[PDB]
Symmetry: D2
Subunit: 93 residues, 4 copies
Amino acid sequence: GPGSGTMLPVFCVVEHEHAEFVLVRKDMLFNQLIEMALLSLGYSHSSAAQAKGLIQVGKWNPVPLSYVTDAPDATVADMLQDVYHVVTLKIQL
Amino acid sequence: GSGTMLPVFCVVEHYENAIEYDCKEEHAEFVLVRKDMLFNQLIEMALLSLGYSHSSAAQAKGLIQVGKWNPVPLSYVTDAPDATVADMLQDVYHVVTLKIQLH
Amino acid sequence: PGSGTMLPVFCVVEHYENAIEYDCKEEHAEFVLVRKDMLFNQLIEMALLSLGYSHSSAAQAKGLIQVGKWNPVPLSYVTDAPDATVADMLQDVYHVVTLKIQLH
Amino acid sequence: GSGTMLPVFCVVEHYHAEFVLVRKDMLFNQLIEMALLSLGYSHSSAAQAKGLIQVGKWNPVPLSYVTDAPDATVADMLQDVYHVVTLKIQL
């Protein structure tokens, strides 16, 4: 079933607008998701590190990624395997 | 069309007192709710549909959960008092769990 | 429960509204809850019954199943397992499938 | 706007499936060729190529079962279901 591979698609909207799917490694830490998405788009290490990111399910209010889970070791797969197709990552440089 | 109803997966937790011990019971089931019902009344509608007394809702807490994310209060989902069930749940009903605790 | 005993199935029921004046091809779309452990080959009839249709029309109806916007296909194409349940076949996909039912 | 790409969970069968991004507005009848190129196969490989698409736990069905509309796009057919289907490509 989809997602059983190594990557998950995450829809990203980057403003500073540009909206686009990015493939992210499932086994990487969820708390690094914003940085990883931006690095995939060619943003510098320092630009990726300083961005503001909110995650949105469907039409719900976007929230900080820290609202999603308290576990420092949560992976992208842990949090997104079941919901990647309805989430939007809203990133502000 | 797309119908008048949307499915919502609900888990109702309530304590049942035996004699020498208590049980934290969990009853999980899908409920159909009207798309046009106000979202902030989801807890009341769910309980009614699951067969709970009207009075149980006035002693209930509820959190809504997407996938395996931390559950959050309904008020965290939207600031709009007039948001409907369809507004908030049409695109995500299959990944949400409504977790209700009866006191 | 843990997973519940019911599963939602989205149905679109087509029927001609008996009018002496003219033919109206009505489509009624609605979700219905059915037992997870019901046999998949019972789904059309039981979906109709659970939606409130009479036994007569639930018995003579013809069904197709549609993934997203794909061409609908007969239910026979879903599985060759004679004892497959509704849960077996639809647990993972009920939110993208439409049961297209044509009444007699 | 809504992105130009769509993820498709693809595998070329032999004897692991992975997501590939493909252009949404491209014809559905070009999907196999697009997926093949993204997976490291040549234009030539697409010539004889056939696809089976698997929905959840269902029997896989030939890609041809999906639509009889020559102008259907990848988005038309896959936007709503790319998270529950696997494209299996047969060379």
